[PDB]
Amino acid sequence: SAMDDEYTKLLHDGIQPVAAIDSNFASFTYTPRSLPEDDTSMAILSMLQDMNFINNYKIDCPTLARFCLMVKKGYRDPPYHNWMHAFSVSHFCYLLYKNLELTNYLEDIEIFALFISCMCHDLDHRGTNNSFQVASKSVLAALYSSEGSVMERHHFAQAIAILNTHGCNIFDHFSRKDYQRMLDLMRDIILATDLAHHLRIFKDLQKMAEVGYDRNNKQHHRLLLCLLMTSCDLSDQTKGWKTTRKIAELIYKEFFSQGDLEKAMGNRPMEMMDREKAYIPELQISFMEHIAMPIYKLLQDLFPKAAELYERVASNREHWTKVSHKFTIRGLPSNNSLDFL
Numbered sequence: 328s329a330m331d332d333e334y335t336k337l338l339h340d341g342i343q344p345v346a347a348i349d350s351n352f353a354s355f356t357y358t359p360r361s362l363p364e365d366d367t368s369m370a371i372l373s374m375l376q377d378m379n380f381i382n383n384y385k386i387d388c389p390t391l392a393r394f395c396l397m398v399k400k401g402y403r404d405p406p407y408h409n410w411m412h413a414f415s416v417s418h419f420c421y422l423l424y425k426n427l428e429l430t431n432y433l434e435d436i437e438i439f440a441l442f443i444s445c446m447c448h449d450l451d452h453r454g455t456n457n458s459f460q461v462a463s464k465s466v467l468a469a470l471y472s473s474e475g476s477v478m479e480r481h482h483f484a485q486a487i488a489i490l491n492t493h494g495c496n497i498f499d500h501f502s503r504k505d506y507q508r509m510l511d512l513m514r515d516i517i518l519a520t521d522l523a524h525h526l527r528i529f530k531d532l533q534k535m536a537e538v539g540y541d542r543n544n545k546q547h548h549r550l551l552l553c554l555l556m557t558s559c560d561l562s563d564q565t566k567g568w569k570t571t572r573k574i575a576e577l578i579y580k581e582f583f584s585q586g587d588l589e590k591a592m593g594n595r596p597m598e599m600m601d602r603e604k605a606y607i608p609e610l611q612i613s614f615m616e617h618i619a620m621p622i623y624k625l626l627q628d629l630f631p632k633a634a635e636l637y638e639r640v641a642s643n644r645e646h647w648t649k650v651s652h653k654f655t656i657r658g659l660p661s662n663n664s665l666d667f668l
């Protein structure tokens with residue numbers, strides 16, 4: 328068994344110093360997708376250690392090693408919503424911790440919940456979205472469609488199922504009150520990853536940003552955790568152009584595969600999921616303008632040190648404008664043939 332030897336080494340070899348992963352591992356310029364997948368569970372432990380969660384919460388090391396491997400194992404391999412996505416989202420949470428002084432805004436247990444939620448937030452994703460669950464009358468829709476956020480409820484339920492697996496409950500020494508709090512936070516934070524939920528609370532986020540963050544305001548904590556989660560989830564867009572071009576490839580491969588399935592079901596896919604209609608530069612510009620940029624502008628409004636993130640996302644949006652002309656075929660194709668007509 329592969330997990331078992333992986334577990335044995337994770338537990339008995341000791342936790343690698345976070346600096347040994349990469350020289351700018353803690354920088355907003357680092358691209359966590361550069362880390363070999365085989366190295367990621369140890370990197371999770373290193374980040375947990377560096378944020379002092381292992382010692383502060385007296386987390387059992389065998390239990391933690393098992394949990395981390397179980398969470399990794401709990402992801403399938405669609406083009407985008409896979410473990411490397413969850414790992415990179417988790418890494419960005421770590422970056423927020425290291426760069427933005429979250430301890431001035433949030434409780435320790437909230438920051439811990441955010442990170443664990445990042446690890447778990449897309450568990451068992453099947454490469455299709457909430458709309459598809461309903462349209463395809465999936466088991467997940469049968470369970471959760473009446474509440475909405477079908478996939479996100481599933482990701483949360485999967486997280487709980489991992490904790491309820493013998494040897495994997497990293498929280499089971501917590502007080503009943505603290506345990507209840509952690510699982511409630513995980514619920515809220517994972518459900519916040521539904522972009523429909525983000526769009527619903529957007530005005531509230533703006534309102535919070537304009538009056539000013541009040542650390543004594545419980546609703547402000549809740550709003551901030553949502554914004555931070557969303558910021559982690561979309562953080563691929565805060566990297567260099569090469570990263571975001573690759574992530575566009577992954578997203579649309581996943582989306583177009585769904586679209587093909589919808590067509591086969593006799594359903595007309597959304598344009599962004601229809602490989603015959605989707606014009607990727609215009610779609611990406613739309614995503615950046617209408618969704619990503621305002622999120623990181625809000626983050627900047629709240630945390631001035633986050634300015635560079637917004638600036639990157641803005642820069643990436645302008646890059647799509649710049650390359651768009653390359654999507655139109657001028658001259659002949661390289662084979663000199665018009666066969667594709």
Ligand SMILES: Cc1cc([C@H]2CCCN(C(=O)c3ccc4ccccc4c3)C2)n2ncnc2n1
Binds near residue numbers: 522560561564599613
């Ligand atoms: C890091 C990142 C993550 C994502 C998606 C992840 C899954 C959910 N997403 C959507 O439902 C969604 C919503 C609105 C959209 C509008 C225009 C184009 C695409 C859209 C996609 C976002 N995209 N999509 C494009 N670039 C991304 N970059």
Ligand SMILES: [Mg+2]
Binds near residue numbers: 448449520521
């Ligand atoms: Mg998700």
Ligand SMILES: [Zn+2]
Binds near residue numbers: 412416448449520
């Ligand atoms: Zn995600």
